[PDB]
Amino acid sequence: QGYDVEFDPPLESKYECPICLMALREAVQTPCGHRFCKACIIKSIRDAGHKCPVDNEILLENQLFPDNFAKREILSLMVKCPNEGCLHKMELRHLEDHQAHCEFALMDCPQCQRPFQKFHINIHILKDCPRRQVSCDNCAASMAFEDKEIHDQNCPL
Amino acid sequence: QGYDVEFDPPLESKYECPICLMALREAVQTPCGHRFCKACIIKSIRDAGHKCPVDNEILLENQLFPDNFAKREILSLMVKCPNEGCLHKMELRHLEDHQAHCEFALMDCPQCQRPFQKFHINIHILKDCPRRQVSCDNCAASMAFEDKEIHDQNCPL
Ligand SMILES: [Zn+2]
Ligand SMILES: [Zn+2]
Ligand SMILES: [Zn+2]
Ligand SMILES: [Zn+2]
Ligand SMILES: [Zn+2]
Ligand SMILES: [Zn+2]
Ligand SMILES: [Zn+2]
Ligand SMILES: [Zn+2]
Ligand SMILES: [Zn+2]
Ligand SMILES: [Zn+2]
């Protein structure tokens, strides 16, 4: 449940959860000196037993504590946007704000329930969709771009 | 009250105590995310009051938490022996066991408490010391080396 992104430079060994093999998310530390994602290690105690997965030492959830130093460094490492095309890095904490605007991202066109790229998403909807709502100039009824001719033969004018 | 030693790979800011400017000793972490020596932050609290130095965020002693991940990192860092003349590098874990047997540590002479390197004491006792005991063939009574001249000119034979 770690951050599934491509860090730049690649994520260092000490900033990786041994459970999900990804960057620590809401980092917590065990008394035996090991870092895990909070939900990763709580589930491990809740599923695999009240132990530490690595060293088999007994692990207390209430003796766990938030490693807010590990968390701080990870959220400022330069990450690549997982969506296609982006080549400018950013601090991982801002990746949440980027994906509410990402122009390289991929979002759907509900006129036909289908994705595009954000620089092309609105470009297709208005001149490219075979299912785009283009009404007949005489009947004023919305029908597909690929269905514009078939109406005109039996079009109530 | 921190680790006073010269690290073979230069010490990184992540392992520095912002109080004593030295490598963390028994590293503990604050709820705000800043590492300190266990002694330093306890000293900084029970001498000033309940605070974190750098950020001034609320901090109690029972709210402290050992950072053994940082501690295990620090004890595996290569260091050089602080004793002058010693040229053997080692991981910080073994530094103490070397420092109690190191030839280049200063030792006090058992006659005049003059300071010498530990290996040199074996020589200074038998050849260089002025207070080393010597026996006179006529009397063979224990006496200081510097006192052999005033004794050989009046020896009762
Ligand atoms: Zn562990
Ligand atoms: Zn994890
Ligand atoms: Zn992007
Ligand atoms: Zn479309
Ligand atoms: Zn029509
Ligand atoms: Zn702090
Ligand atoms: Zn310190
Ligand atoms: Zn030494
Ligand atoms: Zn002496
Ligand atoms: Zn004599």
UniProtKB/Swiss-Prot annotation, chains A, B:
Q: Where is the signal peptide?
A: none
| Residues in TRAF-type zinc fingers | 97-149
What the entry says about post-translational processing? Polyubiquitinated on Lys-71 by TRAF3IP2; after cell stimulation with IL17A. Polyubiquitinated on Lys-71; after cell stimulation with IL1B or TGFB. This ligand-induced cell stimulation leads to dimerization/oligomerization of TRAF6 molecules, followed by auto-ubiquitination which involves UBE2N and UBE2V1 and leads to TRAF6 activation. This 'Lys-63' site-specific poly-ubiquitination appears to be associated with the activation of signaling molecules. Endogenous autoubiquitination occurs only for the cytoplasmic form.
Q: Tell me what happens on changing C17A.
A: Loss of ligase activity, autoubiquitination and signaling capacity
The covalently linked position for Glycyl lysine isopeptide (Lys-Gly) (interchain with G-Cter in SUMO), per the record, is K71, K89
| Crosslinked positions (Glycyl lysine isopeptide (Lys-Gly) (interchain with G-Cter in ubiquitin)) | K71
Zn finger limits (RING-type): 17-56
Q: Where in the cell is it found?
A: Cytoplasm; Cytoplasm, Cell cortex; Nucleus; Lipid droplet
User: According to its UniProt record, in which tissues is this protein expressed?
Assistant: Expressed in heart, brain, placenta, lung, liver, skeletal muscle, kidney and pancreas.
Indicate the impact reported for F65A. Loss of TRAF6 homodimerization and impaired polyubiquitin synthesis
Consequence of substituting R35A = Loss of TRAF6 homodimerization and impaired polyubiquitin synthesis. Loss of TRAF6 homodimerization and impaired polyubiquitin synthesis
Effect ascribed to mutating D4K: Loss of interaction with UBE2N
Changing F65Y has the effect of:
Partially impaired polyubiquitin synthesis
Supply the domain comment.
Answer: The coiled coil domain mediates homo- and hetero-oligomerization.
**Family membership:** Belongs to the TNF receptor-associated factor family. A subfamily.
The record describes its quaternary structure and partners as: Homotrimer. Homooligomer. N-terminal region is dimeric while C-terminal region is trimeric; maybe providing a mode of oligomerization. Upon IL1B treatment, forms a complex with PELI1, IRAK1, IRAK4 and MYD88; this complex recruits MAP3K7/TAK1, TAB1 and TAB2 to mediate NF-kappa-B activation. Direct binding of SMAD6 to PELI1 prevents the complex formation and hence negatively regulates IL1R-TLR signaling and eventually NF-kappa-B-mediated gene expression. Binds to TNFRSF5/CD40 and TNFRSF11A/RANK.
What the protein does comes down to: E3 ubiquitin ligase that, together with UBE2N and UBE2V1, mediates the synthesis of 'Lys-63'-linked-polyubiquitin chains conjugated to proteins, such as ECSIT, IKBKG, IRAK1, AKT1 and AKT2. Also mediates ubiquitination of free/unanchored polyubiquitin chain that leads to MAP3K7 activation. Leads to the activation of NF-kappa-B and JUN. Seems to also play a role in dendritic cells (DCs) maturation and/or activation. Represses c-Myb-mediated transactivation, in B-lymphocytes.
What is this protein identified as? Answer: TNF receptor-associated factor 6
Name the species this protein comes from: Homo sapiens
Record lineage: Eukaryota, Metazoa, Chordata, Craniata, Vertebrata
Q: Which gene encodes it?
A: TRAF6
